[PDB]
CSV table of C-alpha atoms and ligand atoms in Angstrom, one decimal:
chain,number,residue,atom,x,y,z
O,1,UNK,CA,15.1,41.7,33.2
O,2,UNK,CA,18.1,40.7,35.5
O,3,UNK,CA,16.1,37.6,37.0
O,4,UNK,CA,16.3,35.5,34.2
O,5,UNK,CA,20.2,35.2,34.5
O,6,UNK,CA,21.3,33.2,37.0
O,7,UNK,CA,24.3,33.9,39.1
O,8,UNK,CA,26.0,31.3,39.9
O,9,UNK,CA,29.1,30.2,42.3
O,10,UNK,CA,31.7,27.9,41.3
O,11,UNK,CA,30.5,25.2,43.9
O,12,UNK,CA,27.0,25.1,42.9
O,13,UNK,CA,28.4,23.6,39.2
O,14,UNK,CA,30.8,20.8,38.5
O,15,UNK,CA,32.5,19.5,35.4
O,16,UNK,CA,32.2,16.2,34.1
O,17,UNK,CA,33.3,15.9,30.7
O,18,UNK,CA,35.0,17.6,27.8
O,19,UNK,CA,32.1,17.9,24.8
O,20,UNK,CA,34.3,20.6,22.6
O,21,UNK,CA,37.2,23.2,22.9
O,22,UNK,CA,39.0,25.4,20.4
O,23,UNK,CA,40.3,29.2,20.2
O,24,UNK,CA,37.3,30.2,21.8
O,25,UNK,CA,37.4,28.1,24.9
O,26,UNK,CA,36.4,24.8,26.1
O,27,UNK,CA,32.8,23.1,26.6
O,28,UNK,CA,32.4,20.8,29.5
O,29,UNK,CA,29.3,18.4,30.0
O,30,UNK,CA,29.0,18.8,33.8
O,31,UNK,CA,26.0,18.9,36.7
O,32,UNK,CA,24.5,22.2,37.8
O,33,UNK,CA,23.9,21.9,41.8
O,34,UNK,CA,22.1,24.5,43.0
O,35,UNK,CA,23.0,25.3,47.0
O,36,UNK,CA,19.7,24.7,48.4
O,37,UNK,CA,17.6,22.5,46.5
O,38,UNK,CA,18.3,18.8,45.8
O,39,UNK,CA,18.8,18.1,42.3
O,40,UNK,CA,22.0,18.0,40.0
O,41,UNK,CA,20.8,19.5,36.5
O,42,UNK,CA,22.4,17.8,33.3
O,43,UNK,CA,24.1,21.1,31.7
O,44,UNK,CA,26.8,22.4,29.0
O,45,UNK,CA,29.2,24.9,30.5
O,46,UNK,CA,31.5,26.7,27.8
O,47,UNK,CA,34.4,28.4,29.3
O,48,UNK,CA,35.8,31.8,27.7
O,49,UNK,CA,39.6,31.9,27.5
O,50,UNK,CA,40.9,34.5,29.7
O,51,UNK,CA,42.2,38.0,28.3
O,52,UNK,CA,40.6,38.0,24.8
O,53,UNK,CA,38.5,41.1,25.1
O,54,UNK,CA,39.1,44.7,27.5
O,55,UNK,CA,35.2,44.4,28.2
O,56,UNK,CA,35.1,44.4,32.0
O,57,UNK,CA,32.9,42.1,34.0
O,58,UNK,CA,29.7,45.0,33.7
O,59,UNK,CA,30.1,45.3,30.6
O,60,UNK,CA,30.0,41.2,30.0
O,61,UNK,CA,26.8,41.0,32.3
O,62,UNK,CA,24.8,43.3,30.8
O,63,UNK,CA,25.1,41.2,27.8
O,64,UNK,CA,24.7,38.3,29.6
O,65,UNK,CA,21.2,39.5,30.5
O,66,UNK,CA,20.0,39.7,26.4
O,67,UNK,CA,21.1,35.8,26.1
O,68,UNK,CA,19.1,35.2,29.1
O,69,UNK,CA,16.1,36.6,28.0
O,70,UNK,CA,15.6,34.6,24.5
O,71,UNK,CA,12.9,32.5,24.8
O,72,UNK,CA,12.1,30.6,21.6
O,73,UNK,CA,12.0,26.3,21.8
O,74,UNK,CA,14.3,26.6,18.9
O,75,UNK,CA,16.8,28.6,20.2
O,76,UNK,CA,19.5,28.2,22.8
O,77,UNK,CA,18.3,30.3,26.3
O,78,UNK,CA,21.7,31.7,28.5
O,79,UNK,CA,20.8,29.7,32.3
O,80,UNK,CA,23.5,30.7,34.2
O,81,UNK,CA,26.7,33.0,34.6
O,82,UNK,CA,30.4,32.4,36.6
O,83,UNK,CA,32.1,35.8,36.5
O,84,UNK,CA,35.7,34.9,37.6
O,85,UNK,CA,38.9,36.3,35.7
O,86,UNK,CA,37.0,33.7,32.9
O,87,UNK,CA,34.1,34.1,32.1
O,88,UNK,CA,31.9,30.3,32.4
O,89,UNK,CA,28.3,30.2,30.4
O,90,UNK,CA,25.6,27.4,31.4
O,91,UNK,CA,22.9,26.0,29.5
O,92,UNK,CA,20.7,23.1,29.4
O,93,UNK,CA,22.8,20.3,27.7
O,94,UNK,CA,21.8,19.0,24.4
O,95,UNK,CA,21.8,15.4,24.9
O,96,UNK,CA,22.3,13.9,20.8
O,97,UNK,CA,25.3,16.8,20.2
O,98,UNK,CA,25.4,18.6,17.2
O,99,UNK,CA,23.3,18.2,14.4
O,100,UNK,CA,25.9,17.6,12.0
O,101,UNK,CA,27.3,14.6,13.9
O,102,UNK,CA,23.8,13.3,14.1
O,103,UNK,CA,23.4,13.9,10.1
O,104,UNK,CA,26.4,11.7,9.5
O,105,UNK,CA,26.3,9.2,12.4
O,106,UNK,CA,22.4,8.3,11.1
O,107,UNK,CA,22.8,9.0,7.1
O,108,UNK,CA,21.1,5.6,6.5
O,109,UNK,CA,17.8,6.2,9.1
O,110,UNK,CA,16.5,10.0,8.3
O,111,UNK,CA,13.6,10.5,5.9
O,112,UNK,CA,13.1,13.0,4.1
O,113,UNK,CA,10.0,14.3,7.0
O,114,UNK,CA,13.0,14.7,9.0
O,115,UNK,CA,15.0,16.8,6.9
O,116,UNK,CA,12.1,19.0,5.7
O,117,UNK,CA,11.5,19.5,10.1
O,118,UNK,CA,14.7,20.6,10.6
O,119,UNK,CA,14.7,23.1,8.1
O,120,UNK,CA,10.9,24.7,9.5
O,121,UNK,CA,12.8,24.6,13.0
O,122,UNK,CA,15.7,26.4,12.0
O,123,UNK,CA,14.4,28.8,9.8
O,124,UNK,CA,11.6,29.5,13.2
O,125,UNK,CA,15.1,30.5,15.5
O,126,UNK,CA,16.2,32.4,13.2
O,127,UNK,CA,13.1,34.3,12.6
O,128,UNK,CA,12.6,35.0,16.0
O,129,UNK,CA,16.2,36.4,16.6
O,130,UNK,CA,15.6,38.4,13.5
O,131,UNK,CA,12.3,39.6,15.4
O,132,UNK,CA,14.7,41.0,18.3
O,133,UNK,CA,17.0,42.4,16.1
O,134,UNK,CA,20.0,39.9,16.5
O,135,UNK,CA,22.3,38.6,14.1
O,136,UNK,CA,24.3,35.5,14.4
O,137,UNK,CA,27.0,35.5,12.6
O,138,UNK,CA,27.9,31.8,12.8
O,139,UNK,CA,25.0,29.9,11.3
O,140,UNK,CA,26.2,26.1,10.5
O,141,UNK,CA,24.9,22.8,10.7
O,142,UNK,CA,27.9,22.5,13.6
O,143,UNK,CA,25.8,25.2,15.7
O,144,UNK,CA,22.4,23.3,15.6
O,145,UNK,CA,21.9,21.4,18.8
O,146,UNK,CA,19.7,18.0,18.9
O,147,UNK,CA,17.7,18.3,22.1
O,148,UNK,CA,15.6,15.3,20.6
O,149,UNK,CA,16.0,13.8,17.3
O,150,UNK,CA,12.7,15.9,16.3
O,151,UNK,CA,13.4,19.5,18.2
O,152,UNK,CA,16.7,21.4,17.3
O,153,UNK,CA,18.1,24.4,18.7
O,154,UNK,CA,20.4,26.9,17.5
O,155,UNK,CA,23.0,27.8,19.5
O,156,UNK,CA,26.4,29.8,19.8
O,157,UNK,CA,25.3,33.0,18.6
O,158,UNK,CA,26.2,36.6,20.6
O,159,UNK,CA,29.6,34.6,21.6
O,160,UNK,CA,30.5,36.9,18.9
O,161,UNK,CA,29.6,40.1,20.4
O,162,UNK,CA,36.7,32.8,10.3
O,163,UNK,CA,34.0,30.8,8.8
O,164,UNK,CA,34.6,31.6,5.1
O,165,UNK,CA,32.5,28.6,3.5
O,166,UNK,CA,29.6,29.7,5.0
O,167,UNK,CA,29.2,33.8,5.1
O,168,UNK,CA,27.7,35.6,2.6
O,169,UNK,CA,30.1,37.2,-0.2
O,170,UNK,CA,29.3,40.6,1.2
O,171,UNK,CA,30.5,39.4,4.7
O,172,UNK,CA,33.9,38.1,3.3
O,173,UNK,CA,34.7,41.4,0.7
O,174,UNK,CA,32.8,43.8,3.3
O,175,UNK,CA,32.2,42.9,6.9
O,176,UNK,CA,28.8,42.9,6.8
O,177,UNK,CA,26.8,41.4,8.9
O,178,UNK,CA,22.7,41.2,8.4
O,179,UNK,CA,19.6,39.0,8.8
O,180,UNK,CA,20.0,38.9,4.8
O,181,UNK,CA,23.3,37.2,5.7
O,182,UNK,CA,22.7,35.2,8.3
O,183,UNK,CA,20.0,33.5,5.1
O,184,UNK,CA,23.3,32.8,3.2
O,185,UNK,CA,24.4,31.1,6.1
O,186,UNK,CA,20.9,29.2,6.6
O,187,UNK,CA,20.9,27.9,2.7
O,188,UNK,CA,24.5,26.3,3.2
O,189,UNK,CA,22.9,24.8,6.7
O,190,UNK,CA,20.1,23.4,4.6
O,191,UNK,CA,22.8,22.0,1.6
O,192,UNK,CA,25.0,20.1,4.9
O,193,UNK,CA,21.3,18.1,5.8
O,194,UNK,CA,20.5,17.3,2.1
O,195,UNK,CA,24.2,16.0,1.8
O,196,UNK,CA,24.4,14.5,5.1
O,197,UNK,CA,26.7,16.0,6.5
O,198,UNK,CA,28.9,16.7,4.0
O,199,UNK,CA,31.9,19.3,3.8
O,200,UNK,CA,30.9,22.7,1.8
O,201,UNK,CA,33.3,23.0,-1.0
O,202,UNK,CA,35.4,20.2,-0.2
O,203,UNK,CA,38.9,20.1,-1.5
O,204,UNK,CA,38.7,24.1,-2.0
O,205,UNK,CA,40.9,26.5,-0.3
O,206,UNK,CA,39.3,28.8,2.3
O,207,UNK,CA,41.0,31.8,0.7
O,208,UNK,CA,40.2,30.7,-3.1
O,209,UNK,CA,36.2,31.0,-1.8
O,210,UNK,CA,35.4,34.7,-2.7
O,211,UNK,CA,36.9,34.2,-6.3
O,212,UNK,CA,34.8,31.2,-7.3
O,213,UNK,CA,31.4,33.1,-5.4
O,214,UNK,CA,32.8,36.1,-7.9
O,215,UNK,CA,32.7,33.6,-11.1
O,216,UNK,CA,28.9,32.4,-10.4
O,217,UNK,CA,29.9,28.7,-8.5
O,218,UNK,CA,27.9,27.5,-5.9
O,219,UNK,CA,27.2,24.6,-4.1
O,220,UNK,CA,26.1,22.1,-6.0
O,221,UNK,CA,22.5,20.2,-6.1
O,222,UNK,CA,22.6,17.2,-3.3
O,223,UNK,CA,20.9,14.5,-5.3
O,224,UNK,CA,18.2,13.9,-2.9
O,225,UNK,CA,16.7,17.5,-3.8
O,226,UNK,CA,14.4,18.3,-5.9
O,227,UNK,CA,14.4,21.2,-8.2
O,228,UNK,CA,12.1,23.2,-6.2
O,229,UNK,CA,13.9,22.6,-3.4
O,230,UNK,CA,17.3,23.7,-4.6
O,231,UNK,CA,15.7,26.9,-5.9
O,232,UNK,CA,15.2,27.5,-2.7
O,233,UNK,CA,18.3,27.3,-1.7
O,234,UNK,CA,20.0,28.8,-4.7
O,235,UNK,CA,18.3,31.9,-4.0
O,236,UNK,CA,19.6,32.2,-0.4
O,237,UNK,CA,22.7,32.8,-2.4
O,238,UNK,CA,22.0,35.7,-4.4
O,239,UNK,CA,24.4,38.5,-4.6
O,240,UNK,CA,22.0,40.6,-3.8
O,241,UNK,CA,21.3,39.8,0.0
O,242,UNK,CA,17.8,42.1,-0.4
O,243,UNK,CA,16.6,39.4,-3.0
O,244,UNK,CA,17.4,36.7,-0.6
O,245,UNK,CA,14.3,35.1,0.8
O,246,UNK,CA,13.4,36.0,4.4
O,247,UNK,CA,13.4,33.4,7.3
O,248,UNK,CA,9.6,34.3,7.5
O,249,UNK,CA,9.2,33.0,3.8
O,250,UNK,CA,11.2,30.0,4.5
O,251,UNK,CA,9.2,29.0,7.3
O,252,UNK,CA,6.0,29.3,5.3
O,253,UNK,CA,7.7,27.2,2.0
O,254,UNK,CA,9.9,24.3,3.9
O,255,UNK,CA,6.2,23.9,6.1
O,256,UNK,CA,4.0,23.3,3.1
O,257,UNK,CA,6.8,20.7,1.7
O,258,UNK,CA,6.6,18.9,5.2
O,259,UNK,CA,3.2,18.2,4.3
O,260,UNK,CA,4.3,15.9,1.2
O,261,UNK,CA,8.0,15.3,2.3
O,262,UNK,CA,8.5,12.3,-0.5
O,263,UNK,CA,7.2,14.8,-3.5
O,264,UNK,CA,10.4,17.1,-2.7
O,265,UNK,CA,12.9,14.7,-1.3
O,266,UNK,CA,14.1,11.3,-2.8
O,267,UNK,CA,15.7,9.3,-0.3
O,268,UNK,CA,16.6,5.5,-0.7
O,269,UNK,CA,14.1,3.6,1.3
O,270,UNK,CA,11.8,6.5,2.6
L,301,V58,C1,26.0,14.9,24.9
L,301,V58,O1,26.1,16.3,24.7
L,301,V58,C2,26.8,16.7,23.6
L,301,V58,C3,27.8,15.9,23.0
L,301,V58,C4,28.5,16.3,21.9
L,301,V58,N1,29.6,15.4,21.3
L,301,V58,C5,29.2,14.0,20.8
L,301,V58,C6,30.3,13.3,20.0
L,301,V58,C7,31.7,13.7,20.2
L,301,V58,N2,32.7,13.0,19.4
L,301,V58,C8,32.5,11.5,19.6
L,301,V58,C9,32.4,13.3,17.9
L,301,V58,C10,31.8,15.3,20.0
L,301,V58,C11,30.5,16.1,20.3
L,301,V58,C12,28.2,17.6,21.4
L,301,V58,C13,27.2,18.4,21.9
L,301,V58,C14,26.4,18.0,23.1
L,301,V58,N3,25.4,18.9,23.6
L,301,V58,C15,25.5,20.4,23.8
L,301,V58,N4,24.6,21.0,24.8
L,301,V58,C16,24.7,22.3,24.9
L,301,V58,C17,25.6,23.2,24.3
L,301,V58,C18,25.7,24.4,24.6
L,301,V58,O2,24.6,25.1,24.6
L,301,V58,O3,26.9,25.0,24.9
L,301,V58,C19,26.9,26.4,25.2
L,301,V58,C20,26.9,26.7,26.6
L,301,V58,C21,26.9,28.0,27.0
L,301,V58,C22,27.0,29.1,26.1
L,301,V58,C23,26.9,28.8,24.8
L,301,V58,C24,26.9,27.4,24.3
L,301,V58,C25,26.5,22.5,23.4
L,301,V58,C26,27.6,23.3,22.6
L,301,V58,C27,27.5,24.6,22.2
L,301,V58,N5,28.7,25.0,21.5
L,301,V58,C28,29.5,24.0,21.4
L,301,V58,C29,30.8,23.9,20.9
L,301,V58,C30,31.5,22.7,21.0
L,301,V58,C31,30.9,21.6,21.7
L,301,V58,C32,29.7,21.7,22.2
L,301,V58,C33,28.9,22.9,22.1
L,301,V58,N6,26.5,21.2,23.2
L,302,CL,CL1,16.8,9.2,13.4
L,303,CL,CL1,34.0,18.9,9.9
C-alpha cells in the first residue's frame, strides 16, 4: 500500500533542533510543511549517514512502505520519506522524549499505576509486531517514546533491516534474533522502569556479559517489586527462549496487576 508513505521534498520539511545523533545518524526536531496546505506539523526527522549499506534507493523504499503501514497506537508509524544520497525518515514527534529520561527526570512522581501501564503498553506494540511477523532487535527503555505521560510508543525498530546488556544470550553466542528474544529484551525494559531508570549491570563490562548470563546472574530484584512481579520478569530470562512468556501472556498478567497496582508495587508515597 504505497499511499501510506509519503514522499516528501526537501522544502516541504525543515529542521529545527538536534534531539539525538550517533553511528547511525542524527535526529532533528523540525516542522513538516506540506506545499499546499497551511500548517507546519511538529515532527522527528532521523537522518541516515550516507554510504552504510549497497541497498539502492528501490530497494530502501520498498521497505519504507512496511514501516508505513504499522498501525498500532503503541507503536511508531513511518510518515514520510526524503530519498537523496541520505536517506531522511519523518514521524510524528514525541513531545516528553524518551521514556528512560522521563523515568529518571520524574523518579519522585510515578506510581506504581503508572509503571504497571507502561508495561500493558509495551508488551501491546510488541504483540502486534509479533502479529506481522517483525522483530525488533533493539527493545530498551531508550527506544520507548512518551507521546503523553500515559501513552508510549515503541520506536526505532526495522532501522535494523551492539546492545549486549539487553539481547538475549542466544543473540550474543548465536545471532539469533526472535519474538522469544525480543521478550528478553522486554523483561530488562520492564527491570529499567522498576529501577527508574537505572543502568543494567552497572559497573560490568559489556564483553564480561555472556559469562555471568553462563554462571546463572541476572539482574537483580528492584526493591519496589514484588515477588510476583519479578517472576515475571525472571522468566523473560530463561535460557530457553521457548519457555519465555509470550507478549500475549504479558499483556493479560501486567493488565490484571493494573487493577491493584499497590498489591504488586511498593512505592514511597503511592
Ligand atoms: C521533544 O522531543 C524529544 C526530545 C528528546 N530529548 C529530551 C532531553 C534531551 N537532553 C536534555 C537529555 C535529550 C532527548 C528526545 C525525544 C523526543 N521525541 C521523539 N519523537 C520522535 C522520534 C522518532 O520517532 O524518531 C524517528 C524518526 C524517524 C524514524 C525513526 C525514528 C524520536 C526518536 C527516535 N529515535 C531517536 C534517537 C535519538 C533521539 C530521538 C529519537 N524522538
Ligand atoms: Cl508523571
Ligand atoms: Cl544511559
Amino acid at each position: 500500500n504505497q499511499a501510506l508513505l509519503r514522499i516528501l521534498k526537501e522544502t516541504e520539511f525543515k529542521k529545527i533542533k538536534v534531539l539525538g545523533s550517533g553511528a547511525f545518524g542524527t535526529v532533528y526536531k523540525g516542522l513538516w510543511i506540506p506545499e499546499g496546505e497551511k500548517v507546519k506539523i511538529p515532527v522527528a526527522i532521523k537522518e541516515l549517514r550516507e554510504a552504510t549499506s549497497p541497498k539502492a534507493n528501490k530497494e530502501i523504499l520498498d521497505e519504507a512502505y512496511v514501516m508505513a503501514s504499522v498501525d498500532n497506537p503503541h507503536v511508531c508509524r513511518l510518515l514520510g520519506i526524503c530519498l537523496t544520497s541520505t536517506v531522511q525518515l519523518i514521524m510524528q514527534l514525541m513531545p516528553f522524549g524518551c521514556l528512560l529520561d522521563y523515568v529518571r527526570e520524574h523518579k519522585d512522581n510515578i506510581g506504581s499505576q503508572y509503571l504497571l501501564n507502561w508495561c500493558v503498553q509495551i508488551a501491546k506494540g510488541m504483540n502486534y509486531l509479533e502479529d506481522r511477523r517483525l522483530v525488533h532487535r533493539d527493545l530498551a527503555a531508550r527506544n520507548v517514546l512518551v507521546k503523553t505521560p500515559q501513552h508510549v510508543k515503541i520506536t526505532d525498530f526495522g532501522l535494523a533491516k551492539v546492545p549486549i546488556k539487553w539481547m538475549a544470550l542466544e543473540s550474543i553466542l548465536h545471532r539469533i534474533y526472535t519474538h522469544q528474544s525480543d521478550v528478553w529484551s522486554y523483561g530488562v525494559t520492564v527491570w529499567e522502569l522498576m529501577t527508574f531508570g537505572s543502568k543494567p549491570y552497572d559497573g560490568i563490562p559489556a564483553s564480561e556479559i555472556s559469562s555471568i548470563l553462563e554462571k546463572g546472574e541476572r539482574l537483580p530484584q528492584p526493591p519496589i517489586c514484588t515477588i510476583d512481579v519479578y517472576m515475571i520478569m525472571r522468566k523473560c530470562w530463561m535460557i530457553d527462549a521457548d519457555s519465555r512468556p509470550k507478549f500475549r501472556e504479558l499483556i493479560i498478567e501486567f493488565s490484571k496487576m493494573a487493577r491493584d497496582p499497590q498489591r504488586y508495587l511498593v512505592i514511597q508515597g503511592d
